[PDB]
Amino acid sequence: AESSLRVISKEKNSITVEMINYDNTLLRTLVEEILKDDQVDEARYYIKHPVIDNPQIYVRVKSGKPQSAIKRAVRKLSKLYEDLGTQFQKEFQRYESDH
Amino acid sequence: AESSLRVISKEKNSITVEMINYDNTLLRTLVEEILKDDQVDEARYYIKHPVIDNPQIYVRVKSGKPQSAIKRAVRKLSKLYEDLGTQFQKEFQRYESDHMI
Amino acid sequence: AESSLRVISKEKNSITVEMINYDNTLLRTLVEEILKDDQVDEARYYIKHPVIDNPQIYVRVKSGKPQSAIKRAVRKLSKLYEDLGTQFQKEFQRYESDH
Amino acid sequence: ESSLRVISKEKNSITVEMINYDNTLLRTLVEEILKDDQVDEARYYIKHPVIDNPQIYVRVKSGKPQSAIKRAVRKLSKLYEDLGTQFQKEFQRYESDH
């Protein structure tokens, strides 16, 4: 049971993707990040069977494509932790250099 | 609004880092991740308690170096979000062209 | 000679103060800081004789007293450099502690 | 919130990374440090060269470079505090006898 995902539906300016075997915290952070986007009208999860099924993310946008709002968010999150890694590595280098 | 961090205390198997201008969600996620590490004794964030100028995180390890426990967690988190994007982008492309599982 | 200052006039929502023997960098920063205030309609200097006289600051406000806008700016600026001193002091003692 | 960090320190010199300050503050700081007769060089780097965050560099003829920075910061704190003293007094004086 690796993590996986699958588009379930795509309409007008909205998309729904089933998120399989993902961390709850990861999923909450994903939607929180999408909600920071001015171009997003809604982003939330839905589920048919809360304790049995995998959650599905639904994203609707006011401008552009929904897939892109997801991409913008994921890219921001990846970059934040990549940058965090650079910041820690440099600070640890400096602190140890000092000591 | 650029973020920054600074090691502000270092003892035997522990370290404290001041974290400035980060999203609170980042700090809690980071600590949640470090707590999954079997070499970690304690990991805490301090954001609203006690009264401090800027958030701090504190990590104490059973083994290895505390700065290493932080690094392991950051690198795991980077991979999680990177892999998430690899899975999405592949799926969007797959679906946009044609070829439901 | 000492720096000094004198109210020249005041009305309803405006004040004019003659600034004497102040460094022009200080005076520029003062007006820049006042201009950051959303309750300020105008803040600038005037002078009768550009190379002979001392500059006069004029401040007009939308709401409140004009003296208050000046106070708020000066207190921000004082606090900024006080805080900078604390930051440098702590950083220098950490850096040398490490070394 | 702003922050700073010493990132290099040589015999008579220091470099400090300065994060989320107003550029006016860095320029004012450097202008003040250059007034000090113990200072050999004082520079800010904001727009040039390409760096992630601004840096200041100070080299002294004598004393310690971190002392030159301290002297300037304390002088600046005093300048703005004294400006406030002079104002507030004057407003109170004026609102009284007008």
Side-chain angles (χ1 to χ4, degrees):
Chain A
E2 57 162 48
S3 304
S4 67
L5 58 86
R6 57 178 183 164
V7 162
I8 299 291
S9 67
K10 53 213 286 168
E11 288 184 23
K12 269 155 284 189
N13 307 139
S14 79
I15 191 172
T16 304
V17 182
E18 180 183 358
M19 310 297 293
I20 305 167
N21 299 157
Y22 277 96
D23 284 308
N24 189 78
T25 293
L26 182 153
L27 296 180
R28 188 168 339 195
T29 66
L30 173 63
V31 293
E32 295 174 343
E33 188 71 3
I34 302 174
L35 287 178
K36 287 168 183 189
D37 192 337
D38 287 334
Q39 293 189 64
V40 165
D41 278 321
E42 175 189 329
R44 65 181 298 115
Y45 293 90
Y46 295 92
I47 198 163
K48 283 172 178 38
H49 306 88
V51 309
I52 296 159
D53 291 345
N54 312 117
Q56 300 184 355
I57 192 178
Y58 172 77
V59 179
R60 200 176 67 244
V61 298
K62 64 190 75 163
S63 69
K65 298 156 159 177
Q67 271 128 150
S68 304
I70 294 173
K71 174 183 199 158
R72 289 196 287 279
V74 170
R75 288 186 308 116
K76 283 186 231 183
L77 288 163
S78 289
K79 179 57 165 33
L80 216 208
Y81 285 97
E82 295 157 358
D83 288 348
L84 190 59
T86 302
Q87 291 170 314
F88 273 119
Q89 187 174 61
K90 285 185 175 211
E91 168 68 8
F92 294 154
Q93 281 165 8
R94 185 183 150 291
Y95 181 86
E96 289 160 50
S97 288
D98 301 332
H99 275 99
Chain B
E2 220 63 80
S3 62
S4 66
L5 49 80
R6 180 79 175 75
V7 171
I8 63 172
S9 195
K10 184 79 166 48
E11 301 284 309
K12 289 214 192 168
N13 305 319
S14 75
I15 197 168
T16 306
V17 184
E18 195 175 31
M19 319 276 295
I20 304 182
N21 304 324
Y22 291 90
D23 259 78
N24 293 163
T25 293
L26 181 143
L27 310 178
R28 302 195 199 94
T29 300
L30 178 57
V31 166
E32 187 193 344
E33 190 72 4
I34 293 158
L35 283 167
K36 295 178 190 176
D37 187 334
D38 69 291
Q39 302 200 73
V40 169
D41 218 293
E42 256 172 48
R44 306 273 311 192
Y45 57 84
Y46 307 90
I47 294 165
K48 39 223 74 206
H49 312 294
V51 182
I52 48 182
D53 296 356
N54 288 295
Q56 285 175 43
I57 64 163
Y58 167 63
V59 180
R60 181 174 40 101
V61 296
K62 316 162 179 153
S63 49
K65 290 173 161 37
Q67 60 270 27
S68 299
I70 297 173
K71 184 176 178 187
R72 292 187 298 270
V74 174
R75 302 290 157 157
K76 287 192 220 165
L77 288 169
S78 292
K79 177 177 175 48
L80 276 164
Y81 290 108
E82 286 162 359
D83 287 351
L84 177 65
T86 299
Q87 290 208 333
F88 272 125
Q89 280 295 296
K90 192 200 292 173
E91 176 55 6
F92 295 155
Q93 182 141 51
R94 170 235 149 334
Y95 191 76
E96 274 218 21
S97 194
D98 284 279
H99 245 66
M100 257 97 101
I101 267 179
Chain C
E2 57 135 2
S3 301
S4 59
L5 58 82
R6 266 218 82 160
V7 165
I8 296 299
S9 36
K10 57 136 80 196
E11 278 155 5
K12 185 189 180 159
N13 302 320
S14 95
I15 208 285
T16 306
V17 186
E18 183 188 353
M19 313 294 293
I20 307 164
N21 303 147
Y22 279 95
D23 220 316
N24 87 98
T25 293
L26 181 151
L27 298 179
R28 186 167 184 176
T29 62
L30 175 59
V31 286
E32 169 200 305
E33 188 70 13
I34 303 167
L35 283 181
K36 283 175 170 77
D37 188 339
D38 300 294
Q39 299 195 63
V40 164
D41 226 49
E42 187 193 322
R44 61 161 276 140
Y45 296 90
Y46 294 94
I47 195 165
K48 273 187 263 260
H49 304 91
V51 310
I52 293 164
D53 289 344
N54 309 121
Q56 298 181 3
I57 194 173
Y58 171 77
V59 182
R60 188 173 78 244
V61 301
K62 303 196 277 220
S63 52
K65 283 189 156 184
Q67 285 104 312
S68 299
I70 292 172
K71 297 165 189 198
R72 291 194 292 271
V74 179
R75 212 84 231 198
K76 279 188 225 167
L77 286 162
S78 292
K79 182 51 162 31
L80 200 77
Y81 286 94
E82 293 157 0
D83 285 350
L84 184 64
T86 304
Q87 289 173 308
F88 270 120
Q89 189 172 246
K90 286 195 182 197
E91 171 60 16
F92 290 152
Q93 71 171 290
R94 288 182 182 137
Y95 189 81
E96 215 199 88
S97 281
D98 297 331
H99 294 261
Chain D
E1 308 258 292
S2 63
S3 56
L4 50 81
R5 52 258 220 99
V6 173
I7 63 171
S8 190
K9 175 71 212 307
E10 255 92 294
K11 26 202 144 211
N12 301 316
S13 73
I14 198 165
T15 310
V16 183
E17 191 167 33
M18 293 180 78
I19 303 169
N20 308 324
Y21 290 92
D22 196 280
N23 299 332
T24 295
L25 180 143
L26 281 81
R27 302 189 284 261
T28 297
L29 179 54
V30 168
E31 178 189 340
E32 191 73 6
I33 295 160
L34 285 166
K35 296 177 192 188
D36 187 336
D37 61 24
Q38 304 198 70
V39 171
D40 207 294
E41 224 169 282
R43 312 257 187 173
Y44 57 84
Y45 307 90
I46 296 169
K47 296 221 215 202
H48 314 296
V50 179
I51 50 186
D52 293 339
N53 291 290
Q55 292 170 40
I56 63 163
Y57 169 66
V58 180
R59 183 173 38 108
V60 294
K61 293 160 159 82
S62 47
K64 299 188 199 221
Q66 52 255 260
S67 304
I69 296 172
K70 184 180 178 179
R71 291 189 295 273
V73 173
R74 303 287 159 158
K75 280 191 274 197
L76 286 166
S77 291
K78 177 176 173 49
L79 282 167
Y80 288 108
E81 285 163 358
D82 288 351
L83 178 61
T85 301
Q86 288 206 334
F87 272 126
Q88 280 300 113
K89 192 206 295 191
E90 174 59 0
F91 296 153
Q92 188 161 3
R93 198 214 42 85
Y94 176 82
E95 298 304 309
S96 150
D97 316 350
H98 37 230

